[PDB]
From a paper:
NUDIX hydrolases are conserved throughout eukaryotes, bacteria, archaea, and viruses. Their name derives from a common substrate structure, nucleoside diphosphate linked to another moiety X.1 The characteristic NUDIX box is shared between family members and contains a sequence motif “GX5EX5 [UA] XREX2EEXGU”, where U is usually valine, leucine, or isoleucine and X is any amino acid. In particular, the nature of their physiological substrates remains an object for debate, e.g., NUDT5 not only predominantly hydrolyzes ADP-ribose (ADPr) to AMP and ribose-5′-phosphate but also exhibits activity against 8-oxo-dGDP, 8-oxo-GDP, 8-oxo-dADP, 2-oxo-dADP, and 5-CHO-dUDP. A recent systematic exploration of the NUDIX family confirmed that both NUDT5 and NUDT14 are able to hydrolyze ADPr and ADP-glucose, yet the function and cellular roles of NUDT14 remain elusive. Here, by screening a small kinase inhibitor library, we identify ibrutinib as a dual inhibitor of NUDT5 and NUDT14 catalytic activities.
The N-methylpiperidine analogue 9 lacking a reactive warhead exhibited significantly increased potency against both NUDT5 (IC50 = 0.270 ± 0.027 μM) and NUDT14 (IC50 = 0.162 ± 0.005 μM). This observation is in line with the cocrystal structure of 1 bound to NUDT5, suggesting that the warhead does not contribute to inhibitor binding. Based on these results, 9 appeared as the most potent dual inhibitor of NUDT5 and NUDT14. We confirmed direct binding of 9 to NUDT5 by SPR (KD ≈ 250 nM) and solved a cocrystal structure of NUDT5 in complex with 9 at a 2.29 Å resolution, suggesting a similar binding mode as observed for compound 1. By contrast, superimposition of the NUDT5 and NUDT14 cocrystal structures in complex with 9 revealed some notable differences: although the main π stacking residues of NUDT14 (Y17 and W34) appear to be conserved in NUDT5 (Y36 and W46), 9 is sandwiched between W46 and W28 in the NUDT5 active site. The hydrogen bond to D35 for NUDT14 is retained with E47 in the NUDT5 structure. In contrast to NUDT5 where the phenoxy group of the inhibitor engages with the hydrophobic side chain of R51, the NUDT14 structure revealed an interaction with L107. R51 is not conserved in NUDT14 and seems particularly important for the establishment of ligand H-bond interactions in NUDT5 as shown for ADP-ribose and TH5427 binding. We confirmed compound 9 as a selective NUDT5/NUDT14 inhibitor by extended biophysical SPR screening of the NUDIX family. Importantly, we validated NUDT5 cellular target engagement for 9 by NanoBRET (EC50 = 1.08 ± 0.07 μM).
Residue numbers in the entry:
A (entry chain AAA): 14 to 208
B (entry chain BBB): 14 to 53, 57 to 208
């Protein structure tokens, strides 16, 4: 019943652009919206991947590996899933294992890959694949995890036990001036609610 | 070693503006970033995690099918809205639920501010966990009274079957599932 009428460019940046989206509401009455799009069209279906990295060791609890980055848009540090944009002609799976090794230094294995899911639907058309990845911590490969962080990327690795995640996050928020990614907190909330 | 230096406005909209953020990296080398901010409260809005509890049934997660102009399509998300001036996130969550879904809920817990799009925006929300006694009379005929210009379809999915039930909806229609909803569902399988 609803659909897009027009998409008028307001301002194009280097990385991202702002557009006035005119659309038809269900009452046959037009409205507008301020929408964000990346300046460079994605060849790949979806824009990026968020990696859910599970650090599995014998004689240890299963840990979820997160990244503490300084995030200019936020003006602070955020705790997020290792994430990055998909290189042109590269499977989401390939991308997830690349972005993990780069951000954390961990060499993992695929578990499963989400369809494209919207990151910020009320602002952006950003879609990602949530890729579930296993890490064999007992393996030698993951003894000395050597990150290949790529240029201008300054990542601190934070592995937290799956069993205690939500409470362990609440502790880090209160203990530092930090912010948790909504998807990391959504994930952690489900782990408590599941048990 | 890292901090924001300056913020040059690129373009201001009615609702949202784009700014060139100059910042210091840890090596004492300055970089730039394109950041989005509201043109105009601790956090910005709430996402409601509404658990429909009925006896002799599986717990359902109540979701909303909204048209999202930025996406050019319909998205399946948690009931969400902006926090009204001088209003608790809890108040907001129970208001936005009743408005979008017609359900009267009870608070379970409220997340701290969590960044919605840290690589783009300074948008934070409170993820509010809410229980719904479907057996109760108040929730017998759930009549959504949605705000003007808000056109929400309610979709209840069984909690037990969520991830598989989502994958089915994506493949079966031209729809998109919100990353936060999919994150929740993924954790339900991964848990224990
Ligand atoms: C009542 N009425 C309803 C529409 C409401 N509304 N909000 C936005 C909007 C979208 C995303 C957004 O993201 C943030 C949030 C915080 C920080 C940085 C980015 C902020 C606002 C919008 C728009 N883009 N176009 C038209 N209407 C818009 C206004 C209030
Ligand atoms: C190597 N490579 C170079 C570009 C780097 N980069 N990416 C972005 C960026 C951020 C958010 C974004 O959101 C989307 C995505 C899809 C659809 C709609 C919105 C898009 C791009 C960025 C920026 N805004 N400012 C400065 N550098 C930026 C990253 C690392």
């Amino acid at each position: 019943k609803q659909y897009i009428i027009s998409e008028e460019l307001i301002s194009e940046g280097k990385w991202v652009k702002l557009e006035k989206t005119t659309y038809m509401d269900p009452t046959g009455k037009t409205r507008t919206w301020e929408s964000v799009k990346r300046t460079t069209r994605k060849e790949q279906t979806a824009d990026g991947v968020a990696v859910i990295p599970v650090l599995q060791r014998t004689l240890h609890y299963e840990c979820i590996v997160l990244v503490k980055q300084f995030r200019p848009p936020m003006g602070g540090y955020c705790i997020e899933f290792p994430a990055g944009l998909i290189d042109d002609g590269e499977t989401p799976e390939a991308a997830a294992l690349r972005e993990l090794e780069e951000e954390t230094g961990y060499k993992g294995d695929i578990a499963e890959c989400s369809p494209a899911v919207c990151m910020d639907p009320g602002l952006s058309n950003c879609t990602i694949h949530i890729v579930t990845v296993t890490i064999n911590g007992d393996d030698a490969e993951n003894a000395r995890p050597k990150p290949k962080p790529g240029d201008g990327e300054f990542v601190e690795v934070i592995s937290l036990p799956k069993n205690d995640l939500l409470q362990r996050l609440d502790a880090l928020v209160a203990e530092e001036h930090l912010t948790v990614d909504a998807r990391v907190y959504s994930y952690a909330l489900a782990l408590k609610h599941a048990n």
